[PDB]
Structures are given as C-alpha cells and as structure tokens.
Design a binder for this molecule. Structure first.
Ligand SMILES: *[C@H]1NC(S(=O)(=O)c2ccccc2C#N)=C(N2CCN(C)C(=O)[C@H]2C)S1
Ligand SMILES: *[C@H]1NC(S(=O)(=O)c2ccccc2C#N)=C(N2CCN(C)C(=O)[C@H]2C)S1
Lengths: 165, 178
C-alpha cells in the first residue's frame, strides 16, 4: 500500500520477438543444429540454449546435464527433415506453427523426439479429426512407430468401429 | 565445441491440403518461467554482472545475454558487440545500485517489478540507463500522478537530469496551467 507494482502484460511476447530477431541475425547464439536428411543437403540452424531448454525437456537435459560453461554446442540430427526442425525452432521462438496437412505426421515425429508435448498433442488432435477409411491404417501404423498411444488407440477404434467392434 | 548426435528411429494415397495451425497462447509466459528458474539455479548463464556502487557491497548477477538483450537495447548493443563464443563473461557495472539492477533483471525475466514508493526515482533512473522503456513509462505515469504545485518544479528538473522527455513535458504542461 506504499508499494509501486507494475506488470507489462505482453512483455514475454515482445521479448520473444527480439530473441527471434537475434536468432535470425545469428547474434548471441551458443548452439548450432546440423540437420541431415537422406540425400537432401545438410541444413544448419543457429539458436540459444536457454530458449531451446525453455521449450523442450530434451534440450534442457542435454544442456544442463552438461554441468560446464563451454560456449558453442553442435547438435547433429539424422533422419529429421530440416523443415521439421525449422518449424519446431520457430515454435520455440514464436509460440506458433502452421503447415499443410501432409506435413503433420512428420512434425509430430520431431515434436515427440524433442518432447514438445503441446505440439505433439495439437498434431494428435488434428490427425484424429482427419481420420477416414483411406488414412486410418497409416495413422495407426505411424502413431505406433513414434509411441503416440492416444493417436494409435483413436485410429484403431475408428477402424474397428467399421466392423461394429 | 561439444558434439551431440541425434537420430530419428499407399497409406496416404488420399490426403488433401487443409492447413494445420497451432499457437500455444501462454508459451512465452511458461518459457520465461523456465528461463527464470535457470537463472536462479545459475544454469546455462553466459554473463555475470559485477555491480559496484560507491559505498555498497559488491553484487554479482548471473543471467543469459539473450534474455537481457530481449528487455534492454543497451544490454543488446553491449552483448552483440562482444566477441562470439566466450562462455562465461564477467561484466563490470558502475553507476547503478545492486538492488536497482536486481529489480531490472527480475523485470526482464518475470515482466513484473515492485518497489517501495520511495525507490521509484532510483528505479526510473536505472530503467533509463538500460532503456527498459516500459518501466521508464510506468515510473513516469506514477510521478505524473503525484504532480502538485509544491513538487512540479522538482519533477520537471529530475526528468531533465535523467533525460526523460515525456515526464519533463508533462511536468512543464502541468506548471503552465498556473
Ligand atoms: C509438408 N512439409 C513437407 S517437407 O517439409 O517438404 C518434408 C519433406 C520430407 C519429409 C518431411 C517433410 C516435412 N514436414 C511436405 N512434403 C514435401 C514434399 N514431399 C515429397 C512430401 O512427401 C511431403 C512430406 S508436406
Ligand atoms: C527503495 N529502494 C531502496 S534501495 O534499493 O535500498 C537503494 C539503495 C541505495 C540507492 C538506491 C536504492 C534504490 N532504489 C531505497 N533506499 C535504501 C535505504 N535508504 C536509506 C534510502 O534512502 C533509499 C535509497 S528506497
């Protein structure tokens, strides 16, 4: 009651905007992600360990288990398409992800790999809404491959429903 | 350079091109919460601010350059003019009391600041020095709100002395009306 208190409602959004600009300008970056998919050319993404750690338990564990200040870390990623890694990094830096429906399985795989659970769930919910007789075997199959129990179940149930099971 | 190595472990003969879009509404708030935990547990920090103020015990504040730059054009210029790949950098700071810098770092990491009414002048001055304009503006509106005939001149002078154009102009406009 003799205290001055102030909260800037959209501070975290504005600050994330500037951190995103610093990423795109390759300023203050302390991690290089090297992404090699099949025969596509290797892609390279600069980022900030603290931002990746703030968005992914997997990145957090890599960088904090590291129990050493050492500057530039290099993460070599195999068998994830670069565009998938671009979409996940942009998600960590912007809170948003947008893509064609054919991209969703691939992005979901990447999201599961880095335990970005909010993206995994949004991908899951979308794919459940897309279920049809043409796609439900693929979706069940993929969902089993990447360990997505809920998507695999919803896809199995949708199939068995056609047989009154 | 420390190296990490990651590996990923007819069906869609019919798929359209419906657009998937997703926004996590409180992502930036949650992420800032984790980055504040990391600061307080001294994890992934790449700067130590050594803050020395005349007749004050030396303080050290560990933080992330990219988070400080995100809230302060001054921290942004200072860190982006630094050499690349330095690991931990110790940065000597003068002209600001540790308790003021501590409140400015907390604001960068939490979006909130609170202080005794009696601190507002000092905290405004610090906010001006680090160009944390949202705190400058909040301290400004609080001082405009205290404007009376006994204090208006002092507030206009204080404004001019710490170089704050809106608070100067509003204090002058308030005096003119008389
Ligand atoms: C949406 N995204 C893409 S992609 O990013 O080009 C791609 C390519 C290969 C593997 C995964 C991803 C992702 N995400 C799409 N496609 C690009 C063109 N081709 C040949 C495809 O089969 C899709 C997956 S869809
Ligand atoms: C509220 N804050 C403080 S402070 O953080 O302790 C401090 C100390 C020195 C210089 C600036 C600031 C600030 N802000 C206050 N006071 C500390 C105790 N005394 C005696 C004071 O006169 C102020 C500056 S007010």
């Amino acid at each position: 009651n003799r205290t001055f208190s102030y909260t800037l409602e959209d501070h975290t959004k504005q600050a994330f905007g500037i951190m995103n600009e610093l990423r795109l300008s390759q300023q203050l970056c302390d991690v290089t992600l090297q992404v090699k998919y099949q025969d596509a050319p290797a892609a390279q993404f600069m980022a900030h360990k603290v931002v990746l750690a703030s968005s992914s338990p997997v990145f957090k564990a890599m960088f904090t288990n590291g129990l050493r200040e050492q500057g530039m870390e290099v993460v070599s990623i195999e068998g994830i398409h670069p565009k998938v890694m671009e979409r996940l990094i942009e998600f960590a830096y912007t809170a948003s992800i947008s893509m064609g429906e054919k991209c969703v399985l691939h992005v979901m795989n990447g999201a599961v790999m880095y335990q970005i659970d909010s993206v995994v769930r949004a991908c899951s919910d979308f794919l459940v809404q897309q279920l049809d007789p043409s796609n439900a075997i693929g979706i069940a199959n993929f969902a089993e491959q990447i360990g997505c129990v809920e998507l695999h179940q919803r896809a199995r149930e949708y199939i068995y429903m056609h047989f009154g099971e």
